[PDB]
Enzyme design. Structure first.
Site, PDB file in Angstrom:
ATOM      1  N   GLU A  11       0.869  -1.018   0.023  1.00  0.00           N
ATOM      2  CA  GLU A  11       0.016   0.298   0.200  1.00  0.00           C
ATOM      3  C   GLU A  11       0.907   1.314  -0.179  1.00  0.00           C
ATOM      4  O   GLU A  11       0.229   2.291  -0.412  1.00  0.00           O
ATOM      5  CB  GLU A  11      -1.047  -0.056   1.099  1.00  0.00           C
ATOM      6  CG  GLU A  11      -2.159  -1.211   1.209  1.00  0.00           C
ATOM      7  CD  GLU A  11      -2.811  -1.042   0.173  1.00  0.00           C
ATOM      8  OE1 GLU A  11      -3.992  -1.726   0.450  1.00  0.00           O
ATOM      9  OE2 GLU A  11      -3.156   0.042  -0.566  1.00  0.00           O
ATOM     10  N   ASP A  20      -6.333   6.404  -5.225  1.00  0.00           N
ATOM     11  CA  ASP A  20      -6.052   5.295  -5.028  1.00  0.00           C
ATOM     12  C   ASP A  20      -6.057   4.859  -6.396  1.00  0.00           C
ATOM     13  O   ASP A  20      -6.407   5.553  -7.325  1.00  0.00           O
ATOM     14  CB  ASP A  20      -6.607   4.395  -4.047  1.00  0.00           C
ATOM     15  CG  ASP A  20      -8.100   3.726  -4.580  1.00  0.00           C
ATOM     16  OD1 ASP A  20      -8.438   4.498  -5.584  1.00  0.00           O
ATOM     17  OD2 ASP A  20      -8.666   3.209  -3.705  1.00  0.00           O
TER      18      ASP A  20
END
Ligand SMILES: [Cl-]
Length: 164
Positions: A11, A20
């Site tokens: 991540e 994202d």
């Protein structure tokens, strides 16, 4: 290697609001804020999550706090879900982390939709599960991350995350 280091590799860490891979407002270590297209909505969610007026920036300690809560919530989500819990209970510790990784990324409902793959995992047909997992939007949209997780299910080792 453990689940925290694994997810930190997958991540990243960013201390300002970012979008994202799907275009959603996110901060920290993959902490989704909102699916809404409004940065103001995202800043309001952030301030509520952290408990102060952040103006879209957080500290590393704040990011790690949200990360601890999110990993805890992913685990508790698995154990409460009648389709995921029996899979998780059947798995060794390395492969359990791979399942947590998928739930962290796509949520409990999303993973519970991989019906055929979960049945193969429970039966310990690792090569067949790995093939079935790759036949997915998940694999086609984030193939490098999906390969690492799938390799972890196939081998029961951390080898996909070493040299990283
Ligand atoms: Cl990827």
């Amino acid at each position: 290697m453990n689940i925290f280091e694994m997810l930190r590799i997958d991540e990243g860490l960013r201390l300002k609001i970012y979008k994202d891979t799907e275009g959603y407002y996110t901060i920290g270590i993959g902490h989704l804020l909102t699916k809404s297209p409004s940065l103001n909505a995202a800043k309001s969610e952030l301030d509520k999550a952290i408990g102060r007026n952040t103006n879209g920036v957080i500290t590393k300690d704040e990011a790690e706090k949200l990360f601890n809560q999110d990993v805890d919530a992913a685990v508790r989500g698995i154990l409460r879900n009648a389709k995921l819990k029996p899979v998780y209970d059947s798995l060794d510790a390395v492969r359990r982390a791979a399942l947590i990784n998928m739930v962290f990324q796509m949520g409990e409902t999303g993973v519970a939709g991989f019906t055929n793959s979960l049945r193969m995992l429970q039966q310990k047909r690792w090569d067949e599960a790995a093939v079935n997992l790759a036949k997915s939007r998940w694999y086609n949209q984030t193939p490098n991350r999906a390969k690492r997780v799938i390799t972890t299910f196939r081998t029961g080792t951390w080898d996909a995350y070493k040299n990283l």
